[PDB]
């Protein structure tokens, strides 16, 4: 009713129309849908052709088109021509609310985060459930049973280590229970303090975020949903214009095409075991959870928890748990997501597609609506009748396989027979780049931050990670908090308490750390893993000490792409905001030809019960009468960034500059000089990979060069300069202070045929586990990963990469650049590398220097903001924004440059995909053009200033800018100091507390944290930096003090490009180095000539 | 007029209305004057002439180890029924009825004094079967390189003793040299006969090449374990008689005929035609060593001998790949007394599993998998350490090899002898040998050498002879390197990771062959005495392993292998559990079927010949072949690092992976639309399972659509050269039903197509709307066309809308209303656009239109009859005839009068 009143009010005070211009840009007529008197549909023949005489015009039936009463008031936002039928047009109509959505009263348009009155001081952990689960003293005896006797079965290799645990599941015959339900064994429970610590919307989201309008209400209320009307236009004829058909974009015709797995998002194909693991770890369950994505659910956050997941859970008897039951919170298309999904029409044949927009129509500070799928309207008998339907992007993008893209590999863009991966796009646009149809914009990968899981007792000292998993911290980048990771994310809770004391370093569950990783020797695997042969009703948790760093975790447990489609067995979650650029060539004929209604089947459904789930195959023959698979092959190709892979990508990331100040992230152009942030070349000290791990067969396998020396990067560990190459086993992990990990023990030894015992742990280890640790020679130790690299590129272009801070600019809390920062001593605490809480893959000190948080890089006077690795006491730290408020959804028009190149505005950058359609070897395939207006760059809400992009007749795309159109924040903090001030880049970065850093051998082990729950009250001067306004004030950009152009309305144009632009073939290839190092040398040699590499400042001209 | 196979012998022409022509059903086998024992294999249309390939179940061939006519038909029991290819022309005054034009008979190949030596001791593995198991394929590991060169017991002396055996710097003394034939799948000489039983486990069951041992007792034991229908138990064997019969092996009551007869009958399985030549090649279900080249001008009383594939020196891409294939056949210098093998007699790859044969623009395209062939020892005694063992080894490119496809396939790893095995790389393992050339873990130590696994001293006593496998696999060793080569898991560790191609396993062969060399092939076939070689230039080979997704546990492939993958459950063939959904019981041997070339219907730059690309189905994906019509050669790009552009593999999805590849029936190309169609008939499935259980899902059919994708050649000036191989795309088209016995599909027109099916022993018609590649049902039109009242065409429902729509005529008073009085009859006849105003029409489908044709009836009147567009895109009226016979639909002709005398 409120929205109906608003629409009625706006029907009087607002006027909109679509006026047509001649080829010379002279107005001809208006077409004011709210003022067109006696409009009439086109008189049609029997064959459907609209009677038309060029001079008399289109024939009019004299009666208004359908739904005219409820369509006259809507606003036009898009017009698209047909490619075949002459004089036929479609115009996209939306309500005036979708234009005034932001201006609506706050109490009906709320934010998923609340600043509150702050009567008790700001503390980011207040809204986070943090307390850890504790052993159930009434359910101890149902822990998974160790194998009674390992079946030798001619497996001569014998291990004294603890035997595997049995996981037996068999259907039996009981109606609602299983004879054995081992995966459901549940020995843990939530801590009971001031009530049970668990996720429950009722007691947490009292003022729950909810959409304006449920999807059913959008469908029913015709006047509130988008609608497209096919009308015919002729400028020089008497009857110049007349309408055809009117078709509402029904959200129900979209929801009805959701995969059935999306009726129960709290669940996943894994089911009971992962559901239990997540629930106890306080990570929200499922594959697309309203706890993390409240936009898409009619009831919003009111369903944001794991309760009622669509499968029986929490039963007093574990054998009962795991049965399909009634569900109440399916994925839907409420108002915000819907109107993010309406935009960028394209017409193909007799059908017109709406691919959705960038979502800014309803994108608030802490919520990210996106386009979840493709709406299609198909017209029949020559545009006489029509049918409206839509399909989700998930079923369309299932066919993604690495052989397609030329860019990064193993990205989290895959899915499987259950479409638990929910891609959505902030759509730049859809356009024919020559003969190839291109869809472009930004896309949300599968979650890659929460892929590791904490140990059940280490949630009070990893607040950032636990929040990321909880949905309080809507941050996509991977936070480097590796101390408490479980040895394996996918170990059921039935095997967490098999070693409570931790003295034995329980082989099945221990604090993940690669230093104690088992060999891969035939004897080792035969004795440990292969011996416990698994049957249809038995699977084992192997004693093999599985453990690896972030790269290994993702490689095993992320929906990474594979050479075959629908092959991603491990989908954790979906990113919050679009964390990856995406441009895909779609299949025009297939899109035209696919049927309107989709038909899934039992294969797409989840397993009905655990008995069927256990032997659940990944690939099943589709039911004969189903047609869901046909949709899988839409994407002909795709790309996400420059056509570079591995550390070459991070080397380029070093090359791109930061719009905030323009200085490169590398700081290369000038002994304690600043070091690059992403790449490791010339960082730390070279080490030989031939001395790592087995110390065998690696002199020429990883590095083609004769000398396989690899730059360990920042935060490396070495016995001494004389032994920089490889570190021996002196990272012994003690559980208590009780002595080293003690290799050579009977527990950590394997007896092969004959009993010739030997240790199972490597002699020498790689020289770094730092967040910037790269190791082509040890995937178990390496931390840099392609999923991280893509998000890093997107967020570096956006300019909002967070930084860890120990010391703000306050008096007596100042970080001094001089006499306190020593780049030459990165191994010691003098290097200030946190090693805990930092954004994975980057170096905190280098990032801060680039930002200028310390030094005069960004400000005339040193802000004296930095991170200090204190050694004389405990240290607390918090992540803070970059000071810029660009958001990843900030994507403009998709402008086609020529038959082979296209681009769009992205935040403060204009990015042109030079080499996507027809890639050329050796070219990075991307040209970037930065924005020069400081007022726009540093604005509080910059994307409100972008007023569209287009291709200029001269052949260079340009983007409008109105520095007077910036929309300030909703209010001046009312009248009191609001410590949390929402902004598009604002994130509740939780505090991190870390033990004192060692003076020497600082990073030999993982940097241990301590319970940081109570540390919030002791870091007010750091929490105050969470709000972007305070960071800007520190840097001097807080207010008009930025100065420069006062109004400065004008237009910006991308850098001029030529054939040789983007050529890095010299920087690529390999003759005397490694590819990353040679690319680093190449870029370093061209720091003063970034233009020819496709990086430059966009030319800007003033317009009054 | 669509020619569709009624049954094994009858073929009939169907009208676009999906109705057969009267008396058009013809018994072609009798027409060709061939006894009832014959049946037709495949048919092609070329210049409106119908060709047929005839094969008979009565044929019986014999092989004689001595003499001249070693391969000849068995006329003792009137079994001399050679195959025939017959050209048929529709010779009559319009009306589909066929007649003899030319009948070409195919004779058995002649064997030279050099081919005969090889064939005498050649043994052929029993054919792969739809119900074959991985462990059945598996063969127990043979002697290792150390065991075969230094001997057993002499350990820890490899470094010292490897120099004098020309294996300098060899890093894998434990490298396998093949598999022992003492068990496993039954091998048989050309003059012997395969058994109907298959060993479940090929490391413990089956007697392999020991025919005497198998027949003595093991055959009886297999019969006891597996009877023929269940009363059996199948603890050790599978009775695959039904699945052997289904795929084209002839039987005598219960035992298959001799291997030479089986090979001949399998080789006469496919047909392609050209204005000058006709080529016949074998099917995909068992290797075919010989193919016929037929000269259309040959005299009708002459014989058309084939060519030995061993005489066809295909171009495998690079000479390194060619010699890699040629070096695994057998020992070169045997000279024992008569021990001869394909390599020694200077012969190339002898067997291929030809996916299909097709022609376009007078060019013939052939594609298929390289059938494995490798030496084996037959010393039988002191005895050679390699006694009873096949000499095979994986040839995967080493990890060290420089990146780039050319460098990978040219890497000398395994050029001469086995080097792969098991190894440990940092935190993971790489079955491929890490090094090559002269690289080691401590610098350079000189080139790595390899040599054939046969001890030098016993060179005069080792009897080595060739063999032919039933699948692309070359080295059946139950070992990790073998499984990885089969499943395509070998990946180099460098930054620019790539797949190391097993140059001699799972090798896919494709190419285009021209008349200038088909003539040389014919000359080779005619070659008297010593054989003469044939060179095929425009051909190439690409390593195309089975998808890794078809094996349990192997979730994904990367350089870094999960430790569990070292377990014996995944390392070995015998332990490799198969989840293959494509109807095959195994998931370690690839298989292709249904090559069909086609012309690009889309425009092209003026002065450039229209493109033509060919697609061939394969397990888990579609392989497209790209050609340069400007030279009628494989499309290639200058940058060697890029993969050979002429080949592009597109993986499947679940819908296509679920389509049984063993039920391929026919493939048709829609020339005007540009998409293939792969129709699969479930009825081709055998009657009973391998465990003798009746097959419960023999009813149904399904078709797969293959549409072009990517950027094609010569589209625009900036496309005259390409660096990305044009890639195809397969979809589950939409025509599939499990409850109907299909008869045939009709490429009716661009927007529609029809399928003939039977569900109650009575023919039924349902038409499908072709939505630019995909099909879906349109029931409303289906019933309308079905209402033929037994007539040749659907009748016009004058009172209801039907396939012809509904037409309503305007009253004759409209002549007065529009002031047509002044117009003359001729004047109105001259204006069809004015005739339009006399009737209003309601078409039944999109783009359907109707128009009027009128003729004079008097000085003031004329007669008009309507023309209506039909589903096929042809106008139908009173004068409409299909192959002569009138349709006689009975449209409402009208007469109008009232014209002036002007």
Author numbering:
A (entry chain B): 113 to 782, 789 to 1222
B (entry chain A): 27 to 255, 261 to 412, 416 to 936
Mind quoting what the paper says about this structure?
The nap particle is an immunogenic surface adhesion complex from Mycoplasma genitalium. Cryo-electron tomography (cryo-ET) of M. genitalium revealed the tetrameric organization of the nap particle complex, consisting of two P140-P110 heterodimers. The P140-P110 heterodimers form the ‘tight interface’, while the ‘loose interface’ is formed between the two heterodimers.
We next used the single particle cryo-EM dataset of the purified nap particles to analyze the C-terminal stalks that connect the crown region with the sialic acid binding pocket to the transmembrane helices and the intracellular domain. For this, we analyzed 290,179 heterodimers which allowed the resolving of both stalk domains which had not been possible before, since previous heterodimer constructs were truncated. After classification, two distinct classes showing both the stalk regions of P110 and P140 were solved at resolutions of 3.3 Å and 3.7 Å, respectively.
